[PDB]
Amino acid sequence: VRELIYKRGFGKVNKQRIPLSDNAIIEAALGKYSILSVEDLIHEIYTVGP
Amino acid sequence: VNIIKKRTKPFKRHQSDRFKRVGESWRKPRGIDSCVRRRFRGTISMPKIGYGNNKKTRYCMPNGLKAFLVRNVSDVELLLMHNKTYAAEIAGNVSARKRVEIVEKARALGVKVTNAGAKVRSQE
Amino acid sequence: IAKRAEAYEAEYRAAEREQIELARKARAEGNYFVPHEPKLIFVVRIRGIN
Amino acid sequence: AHVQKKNPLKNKAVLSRLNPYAKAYKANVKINSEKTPKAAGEKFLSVLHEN
RNA sequence: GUACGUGAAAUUGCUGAAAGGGAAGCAUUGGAAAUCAGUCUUACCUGGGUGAGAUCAGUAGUCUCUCGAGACUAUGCACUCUGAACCUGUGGUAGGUCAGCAUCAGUUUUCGGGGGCGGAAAAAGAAUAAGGGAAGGUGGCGUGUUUAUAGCCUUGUUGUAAUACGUCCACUGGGGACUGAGGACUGCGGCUUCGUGCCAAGGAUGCUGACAUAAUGGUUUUCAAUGGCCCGUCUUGAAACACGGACCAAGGAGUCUAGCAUCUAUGCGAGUGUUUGGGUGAUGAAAACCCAUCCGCGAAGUGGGAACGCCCUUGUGGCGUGCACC
RNA sequence: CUGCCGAAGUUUCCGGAUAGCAGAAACUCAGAUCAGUUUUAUGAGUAUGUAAAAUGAGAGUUUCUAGUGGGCCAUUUUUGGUAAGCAGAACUGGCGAUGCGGGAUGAACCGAACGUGAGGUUAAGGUGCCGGAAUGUACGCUCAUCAGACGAAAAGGUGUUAGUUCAUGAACUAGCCCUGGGCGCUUAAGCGUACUACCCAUACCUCACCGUCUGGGUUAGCUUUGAGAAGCUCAGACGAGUAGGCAGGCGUGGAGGUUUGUGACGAAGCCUUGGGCGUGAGCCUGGGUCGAACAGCCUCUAGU
Numbered sequence: 001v002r003e004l005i006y007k008r009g010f011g012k013v014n015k016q017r018i019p020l021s022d023n024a025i026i027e028a029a030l031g032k033y034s035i036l037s038v039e040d041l042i043h044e045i046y047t048v049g050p
Numbered sequence: 051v052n053i054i055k056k057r058t059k060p061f062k063r064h065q066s067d068r069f070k071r072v073g074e075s076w077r078k079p080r081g082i083d084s085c086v087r088r089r090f091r092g093t094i095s096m097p098k099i100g101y102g103n104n105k106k107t108r109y110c111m112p113n114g115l116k117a118f119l120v121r122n123v124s125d126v127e128l129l130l131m132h133n134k135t136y137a138a139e140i141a142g143n144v145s146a147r148k149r150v151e152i153v154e155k156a157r158a159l160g161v162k163v164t165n166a167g168a169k170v171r172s173q174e
Numbered sequence: 175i176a177k178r179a180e181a182y183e184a185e186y187r188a189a190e191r192e193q194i195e196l197a198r199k200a201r202a203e204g205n206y207f208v209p210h211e212p213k214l215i216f217v218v219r220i221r222g223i224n
Numbered sequence: 225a226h227v228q229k230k231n232p233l234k235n236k237a238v239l240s241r242l243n244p245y246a247k248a249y250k251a252n253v254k255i256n257s258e259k260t261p262k263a264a265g266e267k268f269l270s271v272l273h274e275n
Numbered sequence: 276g277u278a279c280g281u282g283a284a285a286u287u288g289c290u291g292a293a294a295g296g297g298a299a300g301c302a303u304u305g306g307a308a309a310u311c312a313g314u315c316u317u318a319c320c321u322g323g324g325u326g327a328g329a330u331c332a333g334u335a336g337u338c339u340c341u342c343g344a345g346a347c348u349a350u351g352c353a354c355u356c357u358g359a360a361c362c363u364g365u366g367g368u369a370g371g372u373c374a375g376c377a378u379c380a381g382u383u384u385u386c387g388g389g390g391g392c393g394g395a396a397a398a399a400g401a402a403u404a405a406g407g408g409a410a411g412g413u414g415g416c417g418u419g420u421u422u423a424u425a426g427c428c429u430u431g432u433u434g435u436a437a438u439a440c441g442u443c444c445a446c447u448g449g450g451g452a453c454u455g456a457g458g459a460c461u462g463c464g465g466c467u468u469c470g471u472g473c474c475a476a477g478g479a480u481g482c483u484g485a486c487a488u489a490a491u492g493g494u495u496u497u498c499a500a501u502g503g504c505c506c507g508u509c510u511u512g513a514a515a516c517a518c519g520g521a522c523c524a525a526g527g528a529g530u531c532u533a534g535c536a537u538c539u540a541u542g543c544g545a546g547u548g549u550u551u552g553g554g555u556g557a558u559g560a561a562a563a564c565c566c567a568u569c570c571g572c573g574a575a576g577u578g579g580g581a582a583c584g585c586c587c588u589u590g591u592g593g594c595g596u597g598c599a600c601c
Numbered sequence: 602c603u604g605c606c607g608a609a610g611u612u613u614c615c616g617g618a619u620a621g622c623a624g625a626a627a628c629u630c631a632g633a634u635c636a637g638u639u640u641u642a643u644g645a646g647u648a649u650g651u652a653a654a655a656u657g658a659g660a661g662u663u664u665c666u667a668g669u670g671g672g673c674c675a676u677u678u679u680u681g682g683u684a685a686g687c688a689g690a691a692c693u694g695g696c697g698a699u700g701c702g703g704g705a706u707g708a709a710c711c712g713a714a715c716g717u718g719a720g721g722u723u724a725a726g727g728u729g730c731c732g733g734a735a736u737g738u739a740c741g742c743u744c745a746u747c748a749g750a751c752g753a754a755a756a757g758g759u760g761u762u763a764g765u766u767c768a769u770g771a772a773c774u775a776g777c778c779c780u781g782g783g784c785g786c787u788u789a790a791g792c793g794u795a796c797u798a799c800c801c802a803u804a805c806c807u808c809a810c811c812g813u814c815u816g817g818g819u820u821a822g823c824u825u826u827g828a829g830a831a832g833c834u835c836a837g838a839c840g841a842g843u844a845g846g847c848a849g850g851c852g853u854g855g856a857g858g859u860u861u862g863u864g865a866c867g868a869a870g871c872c873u874u875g876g877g878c879g880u881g882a883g884c885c886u887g888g889g890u891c892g893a894a895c896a897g898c899c900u901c902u903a904g905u
Contacts (some may be wrong), residue, residue, distance in 0.1 A: 051456095
């Protein structure tokens with residue numbers, strides 16, 4: 001899970017494949033769910049959060 | 051941004067070598083059974099948009115300049131601000147008298163001329 | 175993010191140690207341990223579109 | 225922005241940008257010693273070494 | 276040179292070169308041979324000397340524009356300027372193809388060193404040790420034995436382990452290859468007491484070497500390796516098959532017009548349309564320009580776009596076009 | 602000439618009205634719906650159906666408007682069969698509009714679906730030589746004088762290999778051998794199994810470039826100057842294609858305007874293993890030949 005989001009990690013931003021090169025990309029799309037970084041994204045995926 | 055050509059060979063019309071009545075100017079094959087239209091193996095290539103060249107290096111001569119057609123001294127003076135981007139090309143029907151005047155003017159402007167040696171002799 | 179990432183990693187280590195210790199005590203005492211069934215799965219498509 | 229994608233698993237400078245925790249990680253911690261209590265009862269061993 | 280402007284293709288002869296053994300031409304990649312293309316150091320900077328001249332005069336006039344702006348004419352060459360000419364510099368930097376290496380970034384491949392954590396907290400084993408049997412060893416008499424002068428297995432057991440396998444390290448050391456997109460500055464980060472700070476941090480730079488009569492590539496002919504059927508029509512499931520095609524040049528097939536409808540553009544708009552005709556047009560007058568009377572056609576409850584005022588915002592309140600519901 | 606979109610190939614009545622597939626226009630609409638999908642449980646009869654959960658995607662439309670109104674390969678389920686094959690329904694997809702790797706070669710078999718390239722890695726197939734890749738590792742069967750690699754078939758095997766049963770034997774079971782692409786191969790280069798290495802597709806990944814589509818930025822036009830706003834710029838995704846649809850371009854004859862355009866110091870044409878530009882239609886140019894006219898741009902026109 002950790003290596004997939006790092007090497008092959010891209011996010012859907014405005015229906016576009018925008019790589020997760022910065023934590024601000026994840027925060028701008030998943031900040032409403034208190035996901036603010038790649039590690040928060042990894043934690044949500046690995047532990048199957050709410 | 052050095053000049054890259056995706057292809058240097060021309061696209062010859064199919065069967066143009068077999069028949070003298072058939073020119074080599076490209077014609078899109080229309081036969082459904084023709085293997086060239088179906089793009090089989092070993093057959094000749096077809097003009098596709100993927101073969102198109104870089105927009106930045108498009109129309110650029112191998113020295114990086116674009117050929118600008120020139121017919122008199124007025125056309126040469128136009129390239130005063132674009133001598134690093136364009137090369138002057140005198141038209142084929144410009145006489146040897148005007149060609150001389152164009153070539154001296156282009157020399158002062160620092161403008162490369164593609165055919166600056168045509169229809170003239172030298173005498174030092 | 176530093177505090178959250180540190181908390182997440184400690185959670186993973188605690189959970190992994192908990193499974194090891196619980197299985198160790200079940201093996202030693204005599205019963206059997208059934209760990210939780212997986213909730214996260216990674217799917218890879220191995221067949222083409224034809 | 226983001227002309228080139230750099231791998232955090234190879235570029236350490238990109239890793240420090242994305243993860244402000246890899247600076248203090250301490251992966252290989254030692255939890256065992258020379259007093260390991262081998263935990264396998266005779267009941268489990270008999271079941272394992274059965275048939 | 277009257278076989279007469281230009282003189283294409285098909286076709287023919289001679290000469291030169293090359294290739295030859297049957298699908299062939301052709302496509303891809305290079306070699307060889309022949310040939311071709313462009314790319315050059317030259318300038319820039321700086322100093323002095325010598326003279327020069329004006330856009331310089333602690334300068335005099337004219338002209339054209341709107342005091343000063345251009346153009347000139349005399350007079351001086353210092354004060355400024357002209358990288359201005361030459362001498363002086365032999366000062367300093369020196370542009371296009373190739374090649375090499377080093378620091379990097381992206382992608383990738385390939386060996387190696389360690390370190391955790393798991394399993395029967397590996398199983399074995401070395402090793403403490405009780406017993407037993409024989410593929411009966413050694414003794415004893417091939418027969419039977421029980422450590423003898425070998426030992427084997429089992430069992431608990433001697434201080435613990437080690438190793439293998441699995442897994443992980445935001446642990447680490449090398450080798451190889453392909454790529455260098457972008458082009459001031461922003462950003463996210465790491466160092467840094469702070470730094471017009473530094474950095475591997477929103478994409479390659481640095482240090483060199485070789486050449487103009489050469490280097491590098493292109494074209495043509497051919498060769499080698501790999502592949503590769505003859506097109507168009509019709510057929511039918513695609514075919515196949517059957518049709519058309521000796522070669523080359525020229526000619527050769529959705530056009531014009533009258534209605535109708537759609538869409539778009541343009542003019543005007545409850546109107547709209549000058550060109551049947553009349554007026555008029557001095558220079559081309561079949562054009563353009565103007566319009567008297569007729570006439571053709573046309574006509575006679577909710578939701579909701581947008582906006583206002585409140586509400587932290589949502590949201591509320593007043594006001595709703597078009598259209599669809601009632 | 603290039604680019605973009607892209608079928609149907611058939612229900613229903615009956616040459617058509619259709620419907621349906623594919624586009625245009627006019628809309629409204631995320632505080633909403635939709636789905637060759639799976640569900641929860643109970644309704645009915647493991648299947649089937651149900652309302653409301655998971656996953657994905659923003660969806661619903663109204664109008665009109667081109668093209669088609671077949672088959673083939675067959676699979677599967679399946680009916681009748683009838684010497685036996687075979688034939689008859691539905692179903693399922695594919696080919697039909699589709700190139701590519703393999704299959705010795707191959708219209709329907711196994712992979713995989715396509716812009717131009719560089720590098721990497723694979724699929725199906727393969728690694729004795731032809732032929733890119735182990736004359737690799739380990740364990741077994743067989744020697745075929747018609748091996749094997751791809752009905753004469755019942756049997757016969759004083760042909761065997763392993764095992765099962767009863768138990769000195771007897772039979773039985775299963776598998777190899779005989780009788781009834783090339784070169785070559787034989788503890789294989791055949792067959793079976795296991796295990797690592799390796800080969801390469803138009804497939805997958807990373808990057809560059811072309812184009813299309815989608816989204817965003819850009820004016821008191823700031824000394825970043827990059828306002829042909831019809832320009833400039835940023836980002837992501839995608840790329841087969843018949844009929845058909847829609848854009849943008851190339852070229853020819855003539856016309857109005859324009860280039861204060863070219864031309865006897867050589868127009869037009871023609872030739873040329875000269876050079877260059879464009880994905881292309883095409884265009885520019887050197888040399889040769891030649892001897893009087895001709896072109897670019899904006900618009901108009903057509904015996905183009």
